[PDB]
Coordinates of C-alpha atoms and ligand atoms in Angstrom, one line a residue:
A1 CA -8.5 7.8 -36.1
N2 CA -11.7 8.3 -38.1
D3 CA -12.9 10.8 -35.4
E4 CA -14.8 13.7 -36.9
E5 CA -15.3 15.1 -33.5
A6 CA -19.1 15.4 -33.9
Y7 CA -18.8 11.5 -33.8
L8 CA -18.8 11.8 -29.9
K9 CA -22.4 10.7 -30.4
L10 CA -21.0 7.3 -31.5
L11 CA -19.5 6.9 -28.0
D12 CA -22.6 8.0 -26.5
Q13 CA -24.8 5.7 -28.6
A14 CA -22.5 3.0 -27.5
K15 CA -22.7 4.0 -23.7
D16 CA -26.5 4.1 -24.1
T17 CA -26.6 0.7 -25.3
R18 CA -24.3 -0.7 -22.7
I19 CA -26.3 1.1 -19.9
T20 CA -29.7 0.0 -21.5
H21 CA -28.2 -3.8 -21.5
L22 CA -27.1 -3.5 -17.9
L23 CA -30.6 -2.3 -16.9
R24 CA -32.6 -4.9 -18.8
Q25 CA -30.6 -7.8 -17.6
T26 CA -30.8 -6.7 -13.9
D27 CA -34.6 -5.9 -14.5
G28 CA -35.0 -9.3 -15.8
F29 CA -33.4 -10.9 -12.8
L30 CA -35.5 -8.9 -10.4
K31 CA -38.6 -9.5 -12.4
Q32 CA -37.8 -13.3 -12.4
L33 CA -37.2 -13.2 -8.5
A34 CA -40.5 -11.6 -8.0
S35 CA -42.4 -13.8 -10.4
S36 CA -41.8 -17.0 -8.4
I37 CA -41.9 -4.8 -3.9
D38 CA -40.2 -6.7 -1.2
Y39 CA -37.5 -8.8 -2.9
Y40 CA -36.1 -10.0 0.6
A41 CA -39.3 -11.8 1.4
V42 CA -39.6 -13.4 -1.9
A43 CA -35.9 -14.5 -1.8
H44 CA -36.0 -15.8 1.7
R45 CA -39.5 -17.5 1.4
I46 CA -38.4 -20.6 3.0
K47 CA -38.0 -20.0 7.0
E48 CA -36.1 -22.1 9.5
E49 CA -35.8 -20.7 13.0
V50 CA -32.5 -21.0 14.8
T51 CA -32.5 -21.4 18.6
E52 CA -29.3 -23.0 19.5
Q53 CA -25.9 -23.6 18.0
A54 CA -24.7 -26.9 16.8
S55 CA -23.5 -29.3 19.5
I56 CA -20.0 -29.4 17.8
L57 CA -19.6 -25.6 18.1
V58 CA -17.8 -25.7 21.3
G59 CA -16.1 -23.0 23.4
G60 CA -18.5 -20.2 23.6
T61 CA -22.3 -19.5 23.3
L62 CA -23.4 -17.4 20.3
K63 CA -24.8 -14.1 21.2
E64 CA -28.4 -13.3 20.2
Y65 CA -27.4 -11.4 17.0
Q66 CA -25.0 -14.0 16.1
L67 CA -27.8 -16.6 16.3
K68 CA -29.9 -14.5 13.9
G69 CA -26.9 -14.2 11.6
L70 CA -26.6 -17.9 11.6
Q71 CA -30.4 -18.2 10.9
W72 CA -29.9 -15.7 8.0
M73 CA -27.0 -17.6 6.5
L74 CA -29.1 -20.8 6.9
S75 CA -31.9 -19.0 4.8
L76 CA -29.3 -18.7 2.1
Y77 CA -28.9 -22.4 2.2
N78 CA -32.6 -23.3 2.4
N79 CA -33.5 -21.0 -0.4
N80 CA -30.6 -22.0 -2.6
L81 CA -28.9 -18.4 -2.4
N82 CA -25.5 -16.9 -2.4
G83 CA -25.0 -14.1 0.1
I84 CA -22.9 -11.3 1.7
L85 CA -22.5 -11.1 5.6
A86 CA -21.5 -7.3 6.0
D87 CA -21.8 -7.1 9.9
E88 CA -19.8 -4.1 11.3
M89 CA -16.3 -5.0 12.7
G90 CA -16.6 -6.4 16.2
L91 CA -19.8 -8.7 15.7
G92 CA -17.8 -11.9 15.3
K93 CA -18.3 -12.5 11.5
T94 CA -15.5 -15.3 12.0
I95 CA -17.5 -16.9 14.7
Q96 CA -20.8 -16.7 12.8
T97 CA -19.1 -18.3 9.8
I98 CA -17.9 -21.2 11.9
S99 CA -21.4 -21.5 13.3
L100 CA -22.9 -21.8 9.8
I101 CA -20.4 -24.6 9.0
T102 CA -21.0 -26.5 12.1
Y103 CA -24.7 -26.3 11.8
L104 CA -24.7 -27.5 8.2
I105 CA -22.4 -30.3 9.2
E106 CA -24.4 -31.3 12.1
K107 CA -28.0 -30.5 11.2
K108 CA -28.1 -30.9 7.4
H109 CA -25.2 -33.7 7.1
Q110 CA -23.3 -31.5 4.7
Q111 CA -19.9 -32.8 5.6
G112 CA -18.0 -30.5 3.2
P113 CA -15.8 -29.8 1.7
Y114 CA -15.8 -26.1 2.6
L115 CA -13.4 -23.6 1.0
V116 CA -12.5 -20.7 3.3
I117 CA -10.3 -18.0 1.5
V118 CA -9.1 -15.3 3.9
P119 CA -6.6 -12.3 4.0
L120 CA -3.1 -13.8 4.6
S121 CA -2.9 -11.3 7.8
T122 CA -5.9 -13.0 9.4
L123 CA -5.2 -16.6 8.5
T124 CA -3.6 -17.6 11.8
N125 CA -6.6 -16.1 13.7
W126 CA -9.0 -18.1 11.5
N127 CA -7.1 -21.2 12.1
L128 CA -7.1 -20.5 15.8
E129 CA -10.8 -19.7 15.9
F130 CA -11.5 -23.1 14.2
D131 CA -9.3 -25.0 16.7
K132 CA -11.3 -23.4 19.5
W133 CA -14.8 -23.4 18.3
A134 CA -14.8 -26.4 16.0
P135 CA -12.1 -28.8 16.9
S136 CA -14.0 -31.9 15.7
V137 CA -14.1 -30.3 12.0
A138 CA -11.2 -31.7 10.1
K139 CA -9.3 -28.7 8.8
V140 CA -6.3 -28.3 6.3
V141 CA -4.4 -25.0 6.2
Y142 CA -2.9 -24.6 2.8
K143 CA -0.1 -22.1 2.9
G144 CA 3.7 -21.9 2.9
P145 CA 6.4 -22.9 0.5
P146 CA 5.9 -25.4 -2.4
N147 CA 7.6 -28.3 -0.5
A148 CA 5.1 -27.6 2.4
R149 CA 2.1 -27.5 0.2
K150 CA 3.1 -31.0 -1.5
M151 CA 2.5 -32.8 1.9
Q152 CA -1.0 -31.5 1.8
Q153 CA -1.7 -32.5 -1.7
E154 CA -2.1 -36.3 -0.7
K155 CA -4.6 -35.6 2.0
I156 CA -6.4 -33.0 -0.2
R157 CA -6.6 -35.2 -3.3
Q158 CA -8.2 -38.0 -1.2
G159 CA -10.8 -35.6 0.2
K160 CA -10.0 -36.6 3.7
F161 CA -10.7 -33.0 5.1
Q162 CA -13.9 -30.8 5.6
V163 CA -12.5 -27.3 5.7
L164 CA -9.7 -26.0 3.5
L165 CA -8.3 -22.8 4.8
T166 CA -6.2 -20.8 2.4
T167 CA -5.6 -17.3 0.9
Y168 CA -6.2 -15.7 -2.4
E169 CA -2.7 -16.3 -3.5
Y170 CA -2.9 -20.1 -3.5
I171 CA -6.4 -20.1 -5.0
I172 CA -4.6 -18.7 -8.0
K173 CA -1.3 -20.3 -8.1
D174 CA -2.6 -23.9 -7.0
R175 CA -5.8 -23.8 -9.2
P176 CA -4.8 -27.0 -10.9
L177 CA -5.0 -28.8 -7.7
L178 CA -7.7 -26.9 -5.8
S179 CA -10.2 -26.7 -8.7
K180 CA -10.2 -30.4 -9.1
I181 CA -12.3 -30.6 -5.8
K182 CA -16.1 -30.4 -5.9
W183 CA -16.6 -27.7 -3.2
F184 CA -19.8 -27.6 -1.2
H185 CA -19.2 -24.1 0.2
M186 CA -17.0 -21.1 -0.8
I187 CA -16.5 -18.5 1.7
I188 CA -14.4 -15.3 0.9
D189 CA -13.5 -13.2 3.8
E190 CA -12.6 -9.8 2.2
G191 CA -11.7 -8.2 5.6
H192 CA -13.0 -4.8 6.3
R193 CA -10.9 -3.6 3.4
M194 CA -12.1 -5.1 0.1
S195 CA -8.3 -8.7 -9.3
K196 CA -7.2 -11.9 -11.0
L197 CA -9.0 -13.8 -8.2
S198 CA -12.5 -13.2 -9.4
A199 CA -11.7 -14.4 -12.8
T200 CA -10.0 -17.6 -11.6
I201 CA -12.9 -18.4 -9.4
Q202 CA -15.4 -17.8 -12.1
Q203 CA -13.8 -20.1 -14.7
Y204 CA -12.3 -23.0 -12.8
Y205 CA -13.9 -23.4 -9.3
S206 CA -16.9 -25.5 -8.8
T207 CA -18.9 -24.7 -5.7
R208 CA -22.5 -25.1 -4.7
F209 CA -22.7 -22.1 -2.2
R210 CA -21.0 -18.9 -1.8
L211 CA -20.7 -16.3 1.0
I212 CA -18.7 -13.0 1.2
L213 CA -17.6 -11.6 4.4
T214 CA -17.2 -7.7 4.3
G215 CA -17.2 -5.1 7.1
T216 CA -18.6 -2.2 5.2
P217 CA -22.0 -1.5 3.6
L218 CA -22.3 -1.6 -0.1
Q219 CA -19.9 1.1 -1.4
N220 CA -20.3 3.7 -4.3
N221 CA -17.4 1.9 -6.2
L222 CA -18.5 0.5 -9.5
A223 CA -15.6 -1.9 -9.8
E224 CA -16.2 -3.4 -6.2
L225 CA -20.0 -3.6 -6.7
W226 CA -19.4 -5.3 -10.1
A227 CA -16.9 -7.9 -8.7
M228 CA -19.4 -8.6 -5.9
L229 CA -22.4 -8.9 -8.2
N230 CA -20.6 -11.3 -10.4
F231 CA -19.5 -13.5 -7.6
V232 CA -22.8 -13.5 -5.6
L233 CA -25.0 -13.6 -8.8
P234 CA -22.8 -14.9 -11.6
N235 CA -25.5 -15.8 -14.1
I236 CA -26.8 -12.3 -14.8
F237 CA -23.8 -11.1 -16.8
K238 CA -21.5 -14.3 -16.6
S239 CA -18.4 -12.4 -17.1
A240 CA -14.8 -12.4 -15.2
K241 CA -13.8 -8.9 -16.4
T242 CA -13.7 -5.8 -14.3
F243 CA -16.5 -3.3 -14.8
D244 CA -14.3 -0.9 -16.9
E245 CA -13.4 -3.8 -19.1
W246 CA -17.0 -5.1 -19.4
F247 CA -18.5 -1.7 -20.1
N248 CA -15.8 -0.9 -22.7
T249 CA -16.0 -4.2 -24.6
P250 CA -17.8 -2.5 -27.5
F251 CA -14.3 -0.9 -28.3
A252 CA -12.1 -3.8 -27.8
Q253 CA -10.5 2.6 -28.8
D254 CA -11.3 5.1 -25.9
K255 CA -12.7 4.7 -22.6
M256 CA -16.4 5.4 -22.5
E257 CA -17.0 7.7 -19.5
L258 CA -20.2 7.8 -17.5
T259 CA -21.7 11.1 -16.1
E260 CA -21.9 11.4 -12.5
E261 CA -25.7 10.7 -12.7
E262 CA -25.1 7.7 -14.9
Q263 CA -22.7 6.3 -12.3
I264 CA -25.2 6.8 -9.4
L265 CA -27.9 5.3 -11.8
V266 CA -25.8 2.1 -12.2
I267 CA -24.7 2.0 -8.5
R268 CA -28.3 2.1 -7.2
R269 CA -29.4 -0.7 -9.5
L270 CA -26.5 -2.9 -8.5
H271 CA -27.3 -2.1 -4.8
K272 CA -31.0 -3.0 -5.4
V273 CA -30.1 -6.3 -7.0
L274 CA -27.7 -7.3 -4.2
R275 CA -29.8 -6.0 -1.3
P276 CA -31.9 -9.3 -0.7
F277 CA -28.6 -11.2 -0.3
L278 CA -27.0 -8.7 2.2
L279 CA -27.1 -8.8 5.9
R280 CA -25.6 -6.1 8.1
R281 CA -26.1 -5.3 11.8
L282 CA -24.4 -2.2 13.4
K283 CA -22.4 -2.3 16.8
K284 CA -24.6 0.4 18.1
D285 CA -27.9 -1.8 17.7
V286 CA -26.3 -4.7 19.5
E287 CA -24.3 -3.0 22.0
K288 CA -26.0 -4.4 25.1
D289 CA -25.4 -7.9 23.6
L290 CA -21.6 -7.7 22.5
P291 CA -19.4 -10.4 24.1
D292 CA -17.4 -10.3 27.3
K293 CA -14.0 -11.1 25.9
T294 CA -12.7 -11.2 22.4
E295 CA -9.2 -12.5 21.3
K296 CA -7.2 -11.5 18.4
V297 CA -4.0 -12.8 16.9
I298 CA -1.8 -9.9 15.8
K299 CA 1.0 -10.8 13.3
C300 CA 4.3 -9.0 13.6
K301 CA 7.2 -8.4 11.1
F302 CA 10.7 -9.3 11.7
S303 CA 13.2 -6.5 11.7
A304 CA 16.1 -6.9 9.2
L305 CA 18.3 -8.1 12.2
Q306 CA 15.9 -10.8 13.2
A307 CA 15.4 -11.9 9.7
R308 CA 19.1 -12.3 9.2
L309 CA 19.7 -14.0 12.3
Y310 CA 16.7 -16.2 11.8
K311 CA 17.9 -17.5 8.4
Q312 CA 21.4 -18.1 9.5
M313 CA 20.1 -20.1 12.6
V314 CA 17.7 -22.2 10.4
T315 CA 20.4 -23.0 7.9
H316 CA 23.0 -24.0 10.6
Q317 CA 20.2 -26.1 12.2
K318 CA 19.5 -28.1 9.1
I319 CA 23.0 -29.2 9.0
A320 CA 22.4 -31.1 12.3
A321 CA 16.4 -36.1 21.4
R322 CA 15.7 -32.8 22.9
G323 CA 18.8 -31.2 21.3
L324 CA 16.0 -30.4 18.7
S325 CA 13.9 -28.7 21.3
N326 CA 16.9 -26.4 22.0
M327 CA 17.0 -25.4 18.5
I328 CA 13.4 -24.5 18.6
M329 CA 14.0 -22.5 21.7
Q330 CA 16.8 -20.3 19.9
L331 CA 14.3 -19.4 17.1
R332 CA 11.7 -18.4 19.8
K333 CA 14.3 -16.1 21.6
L334 CA 14.8 -14.5 18.1
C335 CA 11.0 -13.9 17.5
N336 CA 10.7 -12.4 20.9
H337 CA 13.9 -10.0 20.8
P338 CA 17.3 -10.4 19.2
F339 CA 18.9 -8.8 22.3
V340 CA 18.3 -11.8 24.4
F341 CA 21.5 -13.0 23.0
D342 CA 24.0 -11.1 24.8
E343 CA 26.6 -11.2 21.7
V344 CA 23.9 -9.7 19.6
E345 CA 23.4 -7.0 22.1
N346 CA 27.0 -6.3 22.4
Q347 CA 27.5 -5.9 18.7
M348 CA 24.4 -3.9 18.0
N349 CA 24.3 -1.9 21.1
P350 CA 27.9 -1.5 22.3
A351 CA 27.2 1.8 24.2
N352 CA 25.0 -0.6 26.4
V353 CA 22.3 2.3 26.8
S354 CA 18.5 2.4 26.3
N355 CA 17.6 3.9 22.9
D356 CA 15.4 3.3 19.8
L357 CA 17.3 0.0 19.1
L358 CA 15.0 -1.5 21.7
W359 CA 12.0 -1.3 19.4
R360 CA 13.6 -0.9 16.1
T361 CA 15.1 -4.3 16.2
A362 CA 12.2 -6.4 17.3
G363 CA 8.9 -6.4 15.4
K364 CA 6.9 -6.9 18.5
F365 CA 8.4 -4.1 20.4
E366 CA 8.0 -1.9 17.3
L367 CA 4.2 -2.7 17.4
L368 CA 3.9 -2.2 21.0
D369 CA 5.6 1.2 20.6
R370 CA 2.7 2.2 18.4
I371 CA -0.4 0.7 20.3
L372 CA 0.7 1.0 24.0
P373 CA 0.2 4.8 23.7
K374 CA -3.1 4.4 22.2
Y375 CA -4.3 2.2 25.2
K376 CA -2.9 4.7 27.5
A377 CA -4.5 7.6 25.9
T378 CA -7.9 5.8 26.1
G379 CA -8.0 4.9 29.8
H380 CA -7.0 1.3 29.5
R381 CA -4.7 -0.8 31.5
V382 CA -2.7 -3.7 30.2
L383 CA -1.5 -7.1 31.6
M384 CA 1.3 -8.5 29.4
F385 CA 2.2 -12.2 29.9
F386 CA 5.6 -13.6 29.0
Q387 CA 6.8 -17.2 28.7
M388 CA 10.5 -16.1 28.5
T389 CA 11.5 -14.3 31.6
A390 CA 14.6 -12.9 29.8
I391 CA 12.3 -10.7 27.7
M392 CA 10.8 -9.1 30.6
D393 CA 14.0 -7.4 31.4
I394 CA 14.3 -5.9 27.8
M395 CA 10.7 -4.9 28.0
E396 CA 11.4 -3.1 31.4
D397 CA 14.3 -1.2 29.6
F398 CA 11.9 -0.2 26.8
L399 CA 9.0 0.9 29.1
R400 CA 11.2 3.0 31.3
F401 CA 12.8 4.4 28.1
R402 CA 9.2 5.5 26.9
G403 CA 8.2 6.6 30.5
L404 CA 5.4 3.9 30.8
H405 CA 4.8 2.9 34.3
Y406 CA 4.5 -0.7 35.1
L407 CA 4.7 -3.3 37.8
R408 CA 6.4 -6.7 37.3
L409 CA 5.7 -10.2 39.0
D410 CA 7.3 -13.3 38.2
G411 CA 8.5 -16.6 40.0
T412 CA 11.2 -14.8 41.7
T413 CA 8.6 -12.5 43.5
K414 CA 8.2 -13.2 47.3
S415 CA 4.8 -14.3 48.4
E416 CA 4.1 -11.0 50.3
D417 CA 5.2 -8.9 47.5
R418 CA 2.9 -10.6 45.2
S419 CA -0.2 -9.5 47.1
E420 CA 1.2 -6.0 47.5
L421 CA 1.8 -5.6 43.7
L422 CA -1.8 -6.9 43.1
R423 CA -3.2 -4.5 45.7
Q424 CA -1.4 -1.6 44.2
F425 CA -2.3 -2.3 40.5
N426 CA -6.2 -2.8 41.5
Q427 CA -6.2 0.6 43.2
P428 CA -8.7 3.2 41.6
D429 CA -6.2 5.8 40.8
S430 CA -3.1 3.5 40.2
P431 CA -0.4 5.3 38.4
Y432 CA 0.6 1.9 36.8
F433 CA -0.5 1.6 33.3
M434 CA 0.9 -1.9 32.8
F435 CA 1.4 -5.2 34.6
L436 CA 4.3 -7.4 33.4
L437 CA 3.5 -10.9 34.4
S438 CA 5.3 -14.2 33.8
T439 CA 3.0 -17.0 32.9
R440 CA 4.7 -19.5 35.3
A441 CA 3.9 -17.3 38.4
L442 CA -4.7 -13.9 40.0
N443 CA -7.5 -11.2 40.3
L444 CA -6.5 -8.3 37.9
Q445 CA -9.9 -6.8 37.3
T446 CA -8.9 -3.2 36.8
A447 CA -7.3 -4.2 33.5
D448 CA -9.5 -4.9 30.4
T449 CA -6.7 -5.3 28.0
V450 CA -4.3 -8.4 27.8
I451 CA -1.2 -8.9 25.6
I452 CA 0.2 -12.4 25.2
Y453 CA 3.7 -11.7 24.2
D454 CA 4.5 -15.2 23.4
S455 CA 3.4 -18.7 24.2
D456 CA 4.4 -22.4 24.4
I457 CA -9.5 -9.9 34.3
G458 CA -12.0 -7.0 33.7
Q459 CA -15.2 -5.9 35.4
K460 CA -18.3 -5.6 33.2
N461 CA -15.9 -4.4 30.6
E462 CA -15.1 -5.4 27.0
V463 CA -11.9 -7.5 27.7
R464 CA -9.6 -7.6 24.7
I465 CA -7.0 -10.1 24.4
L466 CA -4.0 -9.9 21.8
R467 CA -1.8 -12.7 21.0
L468 CA 1.5 -11.4 19.2
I469 CA 2.9 -13.8 16.6
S470 CA 5.8 -13.4 14.4
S471 CA 4.9 -14.0 10.7
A472 CA 6.3 -16.9 8.9
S473 CA 8.0 -18.2 12.0
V474 CA 8.2 -21.0 14.4
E475 CA 5.6 -19.0 16.5
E476 CA 3.1 -19.8 13.8
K477 CA 3.8 -23.6 13.9
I478 CA 3.6 -23.7 17.6
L479 CA 0.2 -22.0 17.6
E480 CA -1.1 -25.0 15.7
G481 CA 3.8 -11.6 -1.9
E482 CA 0.7 -10.6 0.2
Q483 CA 1.0 -8.4 3.1
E484 CA 1.6 -10.8 6.1
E485 CA 0.5 -8.1 8.6
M486 CA -2.1 -5.2 8.7
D487 CA -1.5 -1.5 8.6
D488 CA -2.3 1.0 11.2
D489 CA -5.8 1.8 10.0
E490 CA -6.9 -1.9 10.1
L491 CA -5.1 -2.2 13.4
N492 CA -7.0 0.7 14.8
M493 CA -10.3 -0.9 13.5
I494 CA -9.9 -4.1 15.8
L495 CA -8.2 -2.4 18.7
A496 CA -10.6 0.5 19.1
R497 CA -13.7 -0.3 21.3
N498 CA -16.0 2.5 20.1
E499 CA -15.8 5.6 17.9
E500 CA -14.5 8.0 20.4
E501 CA -11.4 5.8 20.8
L502 CA -10.9 5.2 17.1
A503 CA -10.7 9.0 16.5
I504 CA -8.1 9.1 19.6
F505 CA -6.0 6.3 17.8
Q506 CA -6.1 8.3 14.6
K507 CA -5.1 11.5 16.1
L508 CA -2.0 9.8 17.5
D509 CA -1.2 8.2 14.2
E510 CA -1.1 11.7 12.6
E511 CA 1.1 13.1 15.3
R512 CA 3.4 10.3 14.4
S513 CA 3.1 11.1 10.8
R514 CA 4.9 14.6 11.8
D515 CA 7.6 13.0 13.9
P516 CA 10.9 14.7 12.9
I517 CA 12.7 11.3 12.7
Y518 CA 10.1 8.8 11.8
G519 CA 7.3 10.9 10.3
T520 CA 6.4 10.8 6.6
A521 CA 5.1 14.4 6.6
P522 CA 7.1 17.0 4.5
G523 CA 10.1 18.1 6.3
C524 CA 10.4 14.7 8.2
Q525 CA 13.2 12.3 7.7
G526 CA 11.1 9.4 6.8
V527 CA 13.5 7.0 8.8
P528 CA 11.9 3.5 8.7
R529 CA 10.5 2.4 12.0
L530 CA 11.8 -1.1 11.7
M531 CA 15.7 -1.6 11.2
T532 CA 16.5 -2.1 7.6
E533 CA 19.1 -4.2 5.8
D534 CA 21.3 -1.2 4.9
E535 CA 21.8 -0.4 8.6
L536 CA 23.4 -3.7 9.4
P537 CA 27.1 -4.5 8.9
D538 CA 28.2 -7.8 7.4
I539 CA 27.3 -9.9 10.2
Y540 CA 25.1 -13.1 10.4
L541 CA 25.0 -13.6 6.5
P542 CA 31.9 -20.5 8.8
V543 CA 31.7 -18.7 12.2
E544 CA 31.5 -21.0 15.3
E545 CA 29.9 -18.7 17.9
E546 CA 27.0 -18.3 15.5
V547 CA 26.4 -22.1 15.3
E548 CA 26.2 -22.5 19.0
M549 CA 23.7 -19.6 18.9
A550 CA 21.7 -21.6 16.6
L551 CA 21.5 -24.9 18.5
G552 CA 22.3 -23.7 22.0
Ligands
LIG1 C1 -31.1 -26.8 -0.6 N1 -32.0 -27.7 0.0 C2 -31.8 -29.0 -0.8 C3 -30.4 -29.4 -1.3 C4 -30.3 -30.8 -0.9 S1 -28.6 -31.4 -1.6 O1 -28.3 -32.7 -1.2 O2 -28.4 -31.5 -3.1 O3 -27.4 -30.6 -1.0 C5 -33.4 -27.2 -0.1 C6 -34.3 -27.0 1.0 C7 -34.0 -27.9 2.0 C8 -32.7 -27.8 2.6 C9 -31.7 -28.1 1.4
LIG2 C1 -27.9 -16.5 -5.8 N1 -28.7 -17.3 -6.9 C2 -27.7 -18.3 -7.4 C3 -28.1 -19.6 -7.0 C4 -27.2 -20.1 -5.8 S1 -25.7 -21.0 -6.4 O1 -24.8 -21.3 -5.3 O2 -25.8 -22.1 -7.0 O3 -25.0 -20.2 -7.4 C5 -28.7 -16.4 -8.1 C6 -30.2 -16.2 -8.7 C7 -31.4 -16.8 -7.8 C8 -31.0 -16.7 -6.6 C9 -29.9 -17.7 -6.4
LIG3 C1 -32.8 3.3 -8.0 N1 -33.2 1.7 -7.7 C2 -33.1 1.5 -6.3 C3 -33.6 2.6 -5.4 C4 -33.6 2.0 -4.0 S1 -35.3 1.1 -3.8 O1 -36.0 1.8 -2.7 O2 -36.2 1.5 -4.8 O3 -35.3 -0.2 -3.5 C5 -32.4 0.8 -8.4 C6 -32.6 0.8 -10.0 C7 -33.9 0.8 -10.4 C8 -34.8 1.8 -9.7 C9 -34.6 1.7 -8.3
LIG4 C1 19.2 8.5 14.1 N1 18.5 7.6 15.1 C2 18.4 8.1 16.3 C3 17.3 7.5 17.3 C4 17.3 8.4 18.5 S1 17.8 7.6 19.9 O1 17.3 7.9 21.3 O2 17.6 6.2 19.9 O3 19.2 7.7 20.0 C5 19.5 6.5 15.1 C6 19.6 5.6 13.9 C7 18.3 5.1 13.6 C8 17.3 6.2 13.3 C9 17.2 7.1 14.7
LIG5 NA1 -14.7 -11.3 -5.0

């Protein structure tokens, strides 16, 4: 264009005007906060001590640091503030949030409604924590296909609920329905991790209070800080655009660039403005008070074989009083392992041998294939509960195939064998890494890790309980686009107990990264871990033996 190159002073004159603008607005905000330097003390000038959780927070006593977290979020309410709970992973931000909701309901008579927006991969966990910790709090889970969400719209429109639990996707897609509601509180769980969503909330959603859950401290990313600032403190700049868009609106045409020191200049001011509204405690400073056992739901993918069989079964079933209970059972066999159907095993594994098909065909086995070595490599010992005995046979084949030493106990086990199996497992130097247990058939306090494979311990140790659930399956309903599951890094974050283990977990993830078959390093085949559609013949896509399978 008209760029006589010495005009670069024109971009710089615009950048200086834009930076100066950002500094004076944030200075005005801080000047105002201090007029009514310790900005925390002046922001939280109204105190209220919290000594005990609400009576309706049932099923667990808050830890001391969780009580102080509840007290801090209550200070946001009393002082008419928005805020950010940035506690490190493992401090129970989910539980603290439910403690805030119950406390506001019980003590302050704030019935709701409460808007809780969570990563799809943790939705099921959230739903479960609400059922355990706050059963009296009326809850709507807003997810699924459009015909499943229409059944909610009546209850939602009438306001006959207190908590609406949903994901970012439906906040955007179903805004015409959800933005009609006058929300009391909007809580956004950004996971540990942290586009369109911020604009949708800024323009259409009416809430009286806002809270962000994050797992990291305030970062050095301008885009993320900017998005946080404009959600927590929307009136300073009143813009739904990203930082880059906001910064470059003068030329709405080349991107104005900030020097390294200009970026740091902007980052520190945005940090300073947000600090009085941020609470973050570290695991190392509350280590003595950390809880006894914590439970996490882990969502698992379907393999292409499971997905194919599942769609076919469901279709055949809709064509058709406990014959409906049988259909539900068939879907549950699939979610556990396709090979529980003998016909599927014969077609897929005609050689009738133990190989990588054991874990490539079942999303739960493929997950266990990754995390069981991590536990083994960090000194832990695993109890595994099964509702279906038939899956225990397949698990035995897989464990033997991986060389993992286990014991097994079910209703077939004779009474004197049960005691001997327990005695062996409880031994100090037991070579047995795992205990396979039928839930129908105990003092297993040498194991600190518990995996509930499906559904219908520990000595002074952090006991961890994992509940495996197939995404988008009948298993989700029984427990009652966006990435349905979490990746290895996020998985390492919630399975590792300290920093020494997280390093061990990551070292194993890099060793797998260089596997000749499944690795993604250069010189590796890059074969997918879960079976893919191209690996399947034209089966289960009319055929009688496949309808008996669906309703058996
Ligand atoms: C925030 N506040 C008053 C708000 C009361 S309201 O009914 O509008 O929700 C002020 C300090 C006392 C505790 C609650
Ligand atoms: C956080 N905030 C906003 C008011 C709280 S509100 O939920 O209504 O948005 C901003 C400036 C003063 C301190 C309160
Ligand atoms: C750089 N900073 C924040 C420094 C951190 S402070 O200790 O002062 O709170 C932000 C922009 C204005 C000048 C102070
Ligand atoms: C190539 N391969 C071989 C797996 C090795 S196995 O021990 O299970 O035989 C089989 C096809 C899927 C990708 C892995
Ligand atoms: Na946001």
